[PDB]
Amino acid sequence: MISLIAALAVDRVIGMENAMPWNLPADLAWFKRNTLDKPVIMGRHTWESIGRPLPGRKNIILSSQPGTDDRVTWVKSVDEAIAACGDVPEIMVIGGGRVYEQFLPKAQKLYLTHIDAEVEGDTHFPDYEPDDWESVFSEFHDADAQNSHSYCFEILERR
């Protein structure tokens, strides 16, 4: 099955190119715990934000352009990307925006981090109609010495 994981600010704004104005190590640990040992599919901007292959995961880059690197798999289409993953229980789609747009319709699960931050932004996580999704897990956390803002982890299941 296919899953989407993302960090959303107020109004569902997500990053486009520059790094988001927040510092949430708790959220990065959550991203890690949930994607480890799984293939991850991402767009070119996400690849640049990351800066190197995510370890312990199969890195698949979906893009209309040229693979600048031999350590990851570069695909030009969604079907190629899915194929690249092979036969696994869960495929993780890590963004950015267009990439989430493309896999949404095929997704069965969503791992979202809702962050209490108002950021001005162009892109938004695709519109998802909850009556179509079941919220099965939600856990809020306050900001602290290590996390710049309040955040709530949430898992949703496609009904």
Ligand X SMILES: Nc1nc(=O)c2nc(CNc3ccc(C(=O)N[C@@H](CCC(=O)O)C(=O)O)cc3)cnc2[nH]1
Residues that bind its own copies (CB under 8 A): 17-23, 45, 48-49, 51, 117, 143-149
Please give the DSSP secondary-structure letter assigned to residue 42: E
| Residue of the chain from 1, 28, 83, 88 that contacts ligand X (CB under 6 A) | 28
Kindly state the tokens that stand for 101.
């747009």
* Residue ranges that bind Ca ion, judged by CB under 5 A: 135-136
Is residue 63 part of the contact set for Cl ion (CB under 5 A)?
Answer: no
For the bound state, the minimum distance from the C-beta of residue 95 to its own copies, rounded and expressed in Å, comes to 13
Residue-wise DSSP of 113-150: EEE------S-BPPP--GGGEEEEEEEEE---SS-SS-
The one-letter code for the residue type at 35 is T
In the bound state with Cl ion, the residue whose beta carbon lies nearer, of 104 and 159, is 104
In the bound state with its own copies, the residue whose beta carbon lies nearer, of 48 and 80, is 48
Distance of CA 60 to the CA centre of its chain: 13
**Is residue 19 marked as binding?**
yes
